Amino acid sequence: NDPGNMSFVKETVDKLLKGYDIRLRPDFGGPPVCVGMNIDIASIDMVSEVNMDYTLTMYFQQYWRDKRLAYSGIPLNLTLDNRVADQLWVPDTYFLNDKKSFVHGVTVKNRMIRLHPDGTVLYGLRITTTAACMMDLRRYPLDEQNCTLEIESYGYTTDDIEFYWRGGDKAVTGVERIELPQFSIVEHRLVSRNVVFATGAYPRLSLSFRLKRNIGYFILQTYMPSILITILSWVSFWINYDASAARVALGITTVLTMTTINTHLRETLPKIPYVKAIDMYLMGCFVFVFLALLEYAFVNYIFFSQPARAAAIDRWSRIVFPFTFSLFNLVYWLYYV
Amino acid sequence: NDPGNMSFVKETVDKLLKGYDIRLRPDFGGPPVCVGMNIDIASIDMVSEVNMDYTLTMYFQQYWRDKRLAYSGIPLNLTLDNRVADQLWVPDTYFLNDKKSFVHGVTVKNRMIRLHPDGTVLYGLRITTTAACMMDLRRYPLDEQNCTLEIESYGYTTDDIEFYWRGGDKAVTGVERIELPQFSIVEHRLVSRNVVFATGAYPRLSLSFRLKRNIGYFILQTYMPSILITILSWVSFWINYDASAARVALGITTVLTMTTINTHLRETLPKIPYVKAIDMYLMGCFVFVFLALLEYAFVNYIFFSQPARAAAIDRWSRIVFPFTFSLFNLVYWLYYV
Amino acid sequence: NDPGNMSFVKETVDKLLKGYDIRLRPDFGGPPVCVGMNIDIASIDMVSEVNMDYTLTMYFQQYWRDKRLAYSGIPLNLTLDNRVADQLWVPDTYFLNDKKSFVHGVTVKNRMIRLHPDGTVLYGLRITTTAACMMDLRRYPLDEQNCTLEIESYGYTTDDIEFYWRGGDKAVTGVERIELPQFSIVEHRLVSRNVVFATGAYPRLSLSFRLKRNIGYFILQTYMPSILITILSWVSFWINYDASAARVALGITTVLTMTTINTHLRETLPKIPYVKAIDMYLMGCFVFVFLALLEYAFVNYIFFSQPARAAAIDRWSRIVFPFTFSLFNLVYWLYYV
Amino acid sequence: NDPGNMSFVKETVDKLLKGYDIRLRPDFGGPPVCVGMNIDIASIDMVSEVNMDYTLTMYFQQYWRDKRLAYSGIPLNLTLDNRVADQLWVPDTYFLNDKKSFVHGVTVKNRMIRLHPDGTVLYGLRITTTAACMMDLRRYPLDEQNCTLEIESYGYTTDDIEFYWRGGDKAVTGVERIELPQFSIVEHRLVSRNVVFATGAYPRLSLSFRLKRNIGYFILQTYMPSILITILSWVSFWINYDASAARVALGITTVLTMTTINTHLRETLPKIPYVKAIDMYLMGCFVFVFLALLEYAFVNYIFFSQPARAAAIDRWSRIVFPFTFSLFNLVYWLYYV
Amino acid sequence: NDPGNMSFVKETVDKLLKGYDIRLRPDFGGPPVCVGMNIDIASIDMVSEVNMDYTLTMYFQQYWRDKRLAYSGIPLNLTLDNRVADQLWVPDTYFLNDKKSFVHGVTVKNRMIRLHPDGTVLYGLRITTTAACMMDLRRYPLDEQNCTLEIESYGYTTDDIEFYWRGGDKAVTGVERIELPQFSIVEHRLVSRNVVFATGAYPRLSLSFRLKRNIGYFILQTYMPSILITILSWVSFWINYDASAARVALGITTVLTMTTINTHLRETLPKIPYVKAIDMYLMGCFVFVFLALLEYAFVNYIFFSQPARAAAIDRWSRIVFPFTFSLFNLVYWLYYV
């Protein structure tokens, strides 16, 4: 009678669960139960190129109607303790491409159950998931990546369960609040479709993000040191050819430094078999510094016999090398921009 | 009758739990249940700039009244075994910004339940939580950070549960006992407010700390080596210009050392896209050592033709370079202090 | 009666589980129960040479008939909630060579149960497993590896349980969709056999993959830098012998760089006691650069007394060293290809 | 009747647990229950300066009397299966300063229960705990550390539970068998006291160890290389001043090596804001090598104009530098010993 | 009646468990129950010198007789589902020196129960354990290690439980199949004894392995580079004394390289306070390269005044240094072999 009478509410809930079979889906043997899904993305923790995965924390909500749970006489929505979910049928929703995921359990299990008079159930979970994402690093670090989150029913086919994004394109929220230091979220999309397997067709919901990497870090960390070393190798041109130790030391250090930069960066990334965009720039800078050392070797080889010709090579090297390196940067950056 | 009669106490507790429904909150269908919260901060384990999070261990206590648990005839507060909490309704309190948290369980679950004659429940938990904290590292390592701990109800709106800091500004204790080697806790604040969501308004408690980083470590580790290398590059000025190998080796090593210091430090920090305060100092020191090597290259280029002019440049470099570097430190440190 | 009548379905399922003993296998005391197995390989996460193991995520399905679960009057296959598996006998299938494995449990346990009127049970699990794989690295990085997944019954002998690949060679799917950046899957095989132990013979299913490592990464990371350093050591031949500091510095840096490359790479791999194919190439490159430094030491030792003979050695070194190194690469690569 | 009659023993144990309330402590509402504690330290796994904690594995035993468990007619102590502990009241003992701990569970839970006719309960647990320990590293690596293990009741005040070390100073055993490669256990102490909190006074047991670090590793790893580099810088004194490249290279390498040693060691330790004892020695060695390079710079600056004075400075540097460095070691080591 | 009649088998098993008390050991209050143990070692995953432990995966089987489980009328051994073990008494066997261990649980718990008509129980577990092993590294890497696995009863004394190796020396199998890249298993032993504690004597089973480390890896990784650097320092002897920069650079690089090799290797090993066998060789190689640099310093100090004597020292250094180093290797290797 009275909504505030807890004895009446307790009796109503007890009647719903009496004879309730968790082993059977709602409308078992009839039309498939439609499950609506919304995601409130709390944050994207990290994006790992080494492991080809990203970590996602979100509020995962499922919406479906179970006529066995319909109640009358209480004009209110019943928000029950989360432990009642273990006594109710829930969809066997799982993430297809996840690698490791869990539900937060402090202070209690991060779970909520809300009932409605018509029998509709609101089921929410706070989940941190690590989802695999294959990334094409050919244009790294100027690449754009597309990481998805595939949602599917594990055991029920389309004849038993159907999926849909509740709210259309507004089903997923919080994308604008995601703060990735290395990436920017250009766009997100929602896809609903059915996938055919050997046992039958299964419902599928896809949430995908298009990530564009920020180049500001790589300019300061990799590109600028490579340019400075290349400019450092040009100092040998203005050094007199009689300074054999000084000019060879300039050639050796720049060549060795360029190799260390190229090798050290590649160790951080996964052992991919192809060449990246940054690798092309690093290998190009290696050629310029290597030719600078070979330039003095040619000069040192003819400086005694032909001092006039050796001086000309040094004088022209002060112009060709800076100009060719500028040309190399022009074609390189225009291609990848 | 007798408080020391365990049979009477057992019968009283059994009567309280007979017909008790854990699925229903206290005063279900009526006024919201007010939950008072106090925190005894045991320690702050670590503050991670790489992961943008901090680890917090604390005693989390919740205070609320459940009239179903009121008992008479026993003029004492009943401290029961912690396993009785699984038979009682508890608030669905969770931490909004946490990444991973757990309740200690040695030797038993670090949990306590205390009942009172009027039905009030004291519920304590010892929790270690890792909470995300976005940090602005533009002024690193001279930056000040503000890390919060957001407390919210997962399933109940403000019409069912209300939050408040029990004791006002004295609800959180142990802040003065926190020992962070790298940070000092300038201030902590307590905020109580309601946050509106799609499903309704939810109670929210916020505990925030203002952390000021200690610069003593970074002076010894990064700033002093950068200064010493810059001073090391000034030694080449007093070396005779005929020592081409000696002066170029001084120029090469200082330039290469400066690059290694700048790159090695940045690897430890997360790959942020902007420039930090320490990066500005490191790049400034790179210019001074690079110009020192270019100074000898100009001298070596004219020393044979114009020995008098070359000697003057070395003599003036012994004054301009130390003085300009002192000026650079003056403007740099005043801006960031 | 009606398939859509949930009360009739619930009564039918209750009758099946009444008197059902999970402790007894189907046809206990009679013919062994045949279990058919299919694997849908989701992905191969990584292949670790250091730990000698690989990570596999797959859909593991088991097929067997339990006459105690046969039902009549319902012309449909009963897809039940996954929690019904705890009330049914399941095979004690385990992976012989696994190191750590788990079943995904978000949002629910990644498990499915499907019943059939004749009593057949379909039991599916989504499992991520780390399986040990001993790898022979003598031809590393040009080696080919064979990693297996051994499937066995833990407690039942062949008199109680029998294994077979359901579908023959088509039992395992998704191999073509596996994307390993460092490896290519040449072939996979399915083996069914019985293994004799002290307690008796046990059923065994083997799934093996033949992996061929991609050499593209190692050419860019290890082979090319080794060649460049060796070519770098040849520059000293064109440098005049009077440049003692320049030519010795070329000899020292190349020798030290070669040692660092050989040692740094070997640290990543496990501390195997034998010599790898890459180690042979690195040691061969060390000899060439070491002899180049010794070449100038001989020249520097006789340049004053016999300038004509010293000049000849430098002139011939410009031909013998590039030609011998080319010969060394020819025999090396042909042997390992 | 017969002690070997298992039916009589089973009936006796069943009578004890009939009507037993685990929610109520022994002598509830009366005098506090006294709990005696003994520790058998299996080992101390590691001591971490970075994390400021140590790992401890021990046998934790609790002794208390529960008159509800008193039995007659069996003149023996009942060693029961460990699973009976879940049906009995146990103290809510927890470790105040622990960070992560667990009870071993292979093959069964590492737990034992022993009953006595008067009702006394022996409760043992094998626990591996990681306990926080703040360490003062000002005298590192010649420092002495004091790490404690605080034992407290989580929910019961002194009016309900009391703690004491069973056996006095002999309560903790196995300290002499602890093998720490880096530390030696000078002394251990046992403290029993009551700590006052907001909710009341709580029992507290403290076990502390005084650890003295072994300097043998640091002499071989850090101190000796620093001395050798300093002695290496003295070789430049005997080199002729005309060898500008040779003497500057000696100065550069020693100065750079000293910086690398100081920076590399400090990275391993936590980012403390103060100066350690080892840092003082490393900075002192930096001054000597830096002055050695500056010594030649002064000599090179006046060697042409005043060859006689330049030779004297080199001759005196061969005596002052070795003697002053010996003096620096004398005052340094005496202060810290 | 019929062995294939599952109803009769189910009734027989139900009778065994009716009135069965898991809290009481077999023959409680009488003679101790004898438990026979066999181990089938699957593999030894790794041996860690840093953590002083090894990882072991094995099949652990326990054999004992429980007359309460004796059955008649079924002339077969009952292999039951593994979940029946939770309804039976099992020995409280635990590993004394383990650090972390677990039982595999995919697809089900890796556990088996086999009953026999006389009441004997076969209990098998697949366990991966990490067991602590103190290692003496004085002769590292030419050392021999002895790692054990101590097996004990946690709560029952020798008056209640007794241990023995079932099969004598054949109780442990699979030792010959263990493949350790760094170690070879010389011998394994089985020990059965009783250990006296404060509460009484306890049964103990010990399984120990004698491991001999393979030196092949360390020859290629540490010993050969040390020899090559020492030989590299001998090149300076053939360089003319006028090449001050060349010979000092040879001296500096070899001395610095030797220090880096000694320090880098020691970082991998735990911070032990004593000197290892490899450290003795590395320190010996440091003396030879350091004396080589000091040899030229003496030559450079007298080359102008006494050119004849300086030439003799270089000539004799080409013989004494190679011969003394060969002598040093002879005494070193003979002592440790």
Ligand SMILES: *[C@@H]1O[C@H](CO)[C@@H](O[C@@H]2O[C@H](CO)[C@@H](O[C@@H]3O[C@H](CO[C@H]4O[C@H](CO)[C@@H](O)[C@H](O)[C@@H]4O)[C@@H](O)[C@H](O[C@H]4O[C@H](CO)[C@@H](O)[C@H](O)[C@@H]4O)[C@@H]3O)[C@H](O)[C@H]2NC(C)=O)[C@H](O)[C@H]1NC(C)=O
């Ligand atoms: C990251 O990468 C993934 C994988 O490539 C992208 O996911 C794809 O997204 C596109 C949309 O951008 C999807 O295309 C759409 O599929 C819908 C579902 O298809 C099912 O139903 C149709 C019949 O209606 C069947 O033919 C089909 O086989 C499926 O069963 C379609 O309904 C959509 O059609 C709409 O758009 C087209 C034009 O594109 C119109 O012509 C139609 O009239 C209609 O308006 C559309 O085809 C595609 O299916 C997704 N692939 C997968 C594997 O999920 C992500 O978008 C990408 N991330 C980002 C940020 O770009």
Ligand SMILES: *[C@@H]1O[C@H](CO)[C@@H](O[C@@H]2O[C@H](CO)[C@@H](O[C@@H]3O[C@H](CO[C@H]4O[C@H](CO)[C@@H](O)[C@H](O)[C@@H]4O)[C@@H](O)[C@H](O[C@H]4O[C@H](CO)[C@@H](O)[C@H](O)[C@@H]4O)[C@@H]3O)[C@H](O)[C@H]2NC(C)=O)[C@H](O)[C@H]1NC(C)=O
């Ligand atoms: C780390 O960063 C966080 C986020 O910026 C800071 O948290 C903020 O802290 C300030 C206080 O320092 C909060 O401001 C206060 O909010 C209270 C609650 O607001 C609710 O109720 C009011 C109506 O009463 C509504 O208008 C509002 O929308 C909310 O629903 C207010 O009650 C406070 O008002 C009091 O102070 C103001 C002056 O500041 C007076 O004018 C008022 O009369 C009154 O006395 C106040 O506005 C703010 O809400 C917090 N933000 C968040 C997101 O939590 C942390 O403080 C910071 N850490 C540190 C150490 O600085």
Ligand SMILES: *[C@@H]1O[C@H](CO)[C@@H](O[C@@H]2O[C@H](CO)[C@@H](O[C@@H]3O[C@H](CO[C@H]4O[C@H](CO)[C@@H](O)[C@H](O)[C@@H]4O)[C@@H](O)[C@H](O[C@H]4O[C@H](CO)[C@@H](O)[C@H](O)[C@@H]4O)[C@@H]3O)[C@H](O)[C@H]2NC(C)=O)[C@H](O)[C@H]1NC(C)=O
């Ligand atoms: C690592 O660091 C910790 C913290 O500093 C040390 O722990 C301290 O150890 C000392 C003993 O060495 C403790 O001092 C002793 O405390 C006992 C308990 O005090 C309670 O009871 C007294 C009244 O009896 C109250 O006044 C007090 O407030 C407490 O409620 C005392 O009983 C002891 O007194 C005995 O010794 C003194 C002389 O020291 C005599 O005068 C007395 O008559 C009596 O014989 C004593 O005072 C101290 O409390 C510990 N502190 C903490 C925080 O636990 C560790 O010892 C250290 N580790 C090592 C190896 O040194």
Ligand SMILES: *[C@@H]1O[C@H](CO)[C@@H](O[C@@H]2O[C@H](CO)[C@@H](O[C@@H]3O[C@H](CO[C@H]4O[C@H](CO)[C@@H](O)[C@H](O)[C@@H]4O)[C@@H](O)[C@H](O[C@H]4O[C@H](CO)[C@@H](O)[C@H](O)[C@@H]4O)[C@@H]3O)[C@H](O)[C@H]2NC(C)=O)[C@H](O)[C@H]1NC(C)=O
């Ligand atoms: C790694 O290191 C461990 C520890 O040192 C070694 O373990 C020891 O192994 C030896 C055998 O190699 C053990 O010695 C044997 O102990 C048996 C049990 O002793 C109990 O019973 C006797 C009475 O029978 C009591 O005196 C004793 O206190 C114990 O209660 C003995 O029965 C054995 O005796 C047999 O051999 C001796 C000769 O050695 C004969 O004289 C006897 O007649 C009889 O045949 C024997 O003494 C020793 O106990 C083990 N120690 C521990 C701590 O377990 C490992 O062997 C080693 N690993 C390897 C590979 O070497």
Ligand SMILES: *[C@@H]1O[C@H](CO)[C@@H](O[C@@H]2O[C@H](CO)[C@@H](O)[C@H](O)[C@H]2NC(C)=O)[C@H](O)[C@H]1NC(C)=O
């Ligand atoms: C229940 O499952 C069985 C087994 O998958 C189905 O039987 C198969 O049905 C397909 C067509 O859907 C046939 O091609 C196969 O030959 C059948 N195999 C067997 C062994 O019968 C059965 O159809 C399913 N029941 C329903 C109602 O779909």
Ligand SMILES: *[C@@H]1O[C@H](CO)[C@@H](O)[C@H](O)[C@H]1NC(C)=O
């Ligand atoms: C509350 O509901 C119960 C069950 O219908 C009823 O017995 C009780 O009288 C109600 N309470 C009031 C105050 O009406």
Ligand SMILES: *[C@@H]1O[C@H](CO)[C@@H](O)[C@H](O)[C@H]1NC(C)=O
């Ligand atoms: C303790 O309380 C029980 C229940 O009321 C009662 O039966 C018993 O007599 C009491 N004990 C005493 C000593 O009064």
Ligand SMILES: *[C@@H]1O[C@H](CO)[C@@H](O)[C@H](O)[C@H]1NC(C)=O
């Ligand atoms: C559903 O089945 C139950 C059990 O047989 C039966 O009592 C009930 O009447 C059936 N429902 C209908 C609509 O026939």
Ligand SMILES: *[C@@H]1O[C@H](CO)[C@@H](O)[C@H](O)[C@H]1NC(C)=O
């Ligand atoms: C063992 O004790 C039970 C319970 O008292 C009794 O019924 C049984 O007869 C006893 N057994 C013997 C052999 O006396």
Ligand SMILES: *[C@@H]1O[C@H](CO)[C@@H](O)[C@H](O)[C@H]1NC(C)=O
């Ligand atoms: C199987 O055993 C049960 C229990 O003894 C019995 O009732 C049943 O008749 C037996 N079955 C057959 C076919 O004899």
Ligand SMILES: CCCCCCCCCC
């Ligand atoms: C290692 C390659 C060196 C090339 C030197 C070319 C010199 C040409 C002189 C005519």
Ligand SMILES: [Cl-]
């Ligand atoms: Cl969590």
Ligand SMILES: [Cl-]
């Ligand atoms: Cl814990």
Ligand SMILES: [Cl-]
């Ligand atoms: Cl998972």
Ligand SMILES: [Cl-]
């Ligand atoms: Cl464990």
Ligand SMILES: [Cl-]
């Ligand atoms: Cl496992």
